[PDB]
Amino acid sequence: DEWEVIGGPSEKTFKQRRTFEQRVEDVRLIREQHPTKIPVIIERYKGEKQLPVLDKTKFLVPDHVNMSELIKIIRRRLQLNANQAFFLLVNGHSMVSVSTPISEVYESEKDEDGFLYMVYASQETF
């Protein structure tokens, strides 16, 4: 049509951009400095065509918050209504009980590198 569609370079994930050793060190440093914060990686699902992208990838989340509170925070930062379809994965798993405090989620769902990985999409499929 009237639009020139730029293809551009491919999207690379956080794990593709940093070595396992770098990420282990990243977590190590941040946990020593901010013991009450949870190191969270938040990314958009790879084939997502409806939701916008965040400006950051690495998040420090206060350990007392629950998943419900975090979900809403991410939603607001994506500037979505409470109307838009929105699903969140943690460690590749369907979202756990939303009242679970992230301190507990971290201990059970953190990656081997020490990060807690989250992925968002507009469908529950991914």
Q: Is the CB of residue 65 less than 8 Å from the CB of residue 53?
A: no
74 vs 3: CA distance, rounded Å: 31
How was it solved? X-ray
Report which secondary-structure segment, H or E, holds 109. Answer: helix 102-109
Residues in the chain: 126
Q: What is the CATH number of the domain that holds 29?
A: 3.10.20.90
Angstrom distances, CA of residue 117 to CA of 5, 84, 105: 31, 22, 11
107 vs 1: CA distance, rounded Å: 51
How many CA atoms within 13 Å lie on the side-chain side of 114? 18
Enumerate the β-bridge partners of residue 94: 89
| Residue in the structure block whose two tokens are 């990420």 | 23
Please give the structure tokens belonging to residue 17: 């951009």
Spatial CB neighbours of 91, under 8 Å, sequence gap ≥ 6? 109, 110, 111, 116, 117
**Tally of structural domains, the chain:** 1
Range of the domain at 37: 1-126
| Residue in the structure block whose two tokens are 């946990």 | 31
Spatial CB neighbours of 53, under 8 Å, sequence gap ≥ 6? 44
